């Protein structure tokens, strides 16, 4: 075995829910992780940085090995988390999950010249953590993935393909860097352009649409 928990778990095992875009519409939580295993399988992992700490005991120095993990596919779906642990083999691992509850859309789209098949972002975004400032900017076609090794990485998994970048921003902080960049793409969706204004009209929540299956 999987097994389940909560009203939200049970549903997706059964399969009364299908896509991840249900879940960001009503904007649910997520506690269990299998919740996006069944759905998105495309998903692939990647390990960025394995560093030792340290919390320094009475005749010694303790250590763990922050990893930090990024996950996703191509299509507008990033995942990110940071679980210290001791020994690697919790530390990555129950990083990989840490990221998976944090899957987050993106909102690939056009530079200009509408054309056919999204390559770049919709708009300018920024992010901030402690020090770093990221100014993602939409670039025309295969221009390129203009940035550090790591950012490239994030941004591949999240296709996305092409976009100018810039930092500030101490980016010997692989960890506070990604923290930030992430908090910007996750924020394309958190920016009214004319093409949304056409008022959409609220569906109905899963939490009492399949209310009975959702319980014993």
């Amino acid at each position: 075995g999987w097994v389940p928990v909560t009203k939200l778990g049970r549903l997706v095992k059964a399969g009364k829910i299908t896509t991840i875009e249900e879940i960001f519409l009503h904007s649910l939580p997520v506690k269990e992780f299998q919740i996006i295993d069944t759905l998105l399988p495309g998903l692939q992992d990647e390990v960025m940085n394995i560093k030792p700490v340290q919390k320094q005991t009475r005749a010694g120095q303790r250590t763990r090995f922050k990893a930090v993990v990024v996950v996703g596919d191509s299509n507008g779906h990033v995942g990110l988390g940071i679980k210290t642990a001791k020994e690697v083999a919790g530390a990555i691992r129950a990083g990989i999950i840490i990221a998976k509850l944090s899957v987050i859309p993106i909102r690939r789209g056009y530079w200009g010249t509408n054309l056919g098949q999204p390559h770049s972002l919709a708009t300018k975004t920024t992010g901030k953590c402690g020090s770093v400032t990221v100014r993602l900017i939409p670039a025309p076609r295969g221009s390129g993935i203009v940035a550090s090794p790591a950012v490239k990485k994030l941004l591949q998994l999240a296709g996305v393909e092409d976009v100018y970048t810039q930092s500030n921003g101490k980016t010997r902080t692989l960890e506070n860097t990604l923290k930030a960049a992430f908090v910007a793409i996750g924020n394309t969706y958190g920016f009214l352009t004319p093409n949304l204004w056409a008022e959409q009209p609220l569906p109905v929540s899963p939490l009492d649409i399949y209310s009975d299956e959702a319980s014993a």
């Binding site: 200009g112 076609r141 221009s143």
Partner: protein, 179 residues
Amino acid sequence: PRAPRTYSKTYSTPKRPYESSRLDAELKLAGEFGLKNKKEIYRISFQLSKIRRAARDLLTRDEKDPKRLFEGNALIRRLVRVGVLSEDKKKLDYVLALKVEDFLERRLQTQVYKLGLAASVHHARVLITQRHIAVGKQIVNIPSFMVRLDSEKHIDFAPTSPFGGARPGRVARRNAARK
């Protein structure tokens, strides 16, 4: 003094030098397409990076302005003649979705390979340096040539050459002068 004659390098190196990232996609290139040195992957890289902006430059005129169309419709037809991008894609737009790898197939180096007349890619080349292949009745001795689409069908072997004519070829004025 005299008109000081004019010249630009073609190469534009990389911004970071070393990477088990981009490196192990050159050696996937060389390789698969013949080539030689890294001073090829970076010639191209330049000449794509060249065209790429004359698009960017435009796009940002309006559309319809005299300059934008003219180049576009002159720009484009320069790439229809070299086979690079299709007919069906040329709006402008689109030339941008052209990666390194499309150009390479229209290098003579390889168009020979496809016109097999060559065991592998290699037997595709000595074959060019050694005066062997020919477009009109005319030899070409340089891998980097760039196939002009409307030639292509005229690609040989020439009279000169040993593999289509004027004589046997050196090592043969030897098996017949020791029985």
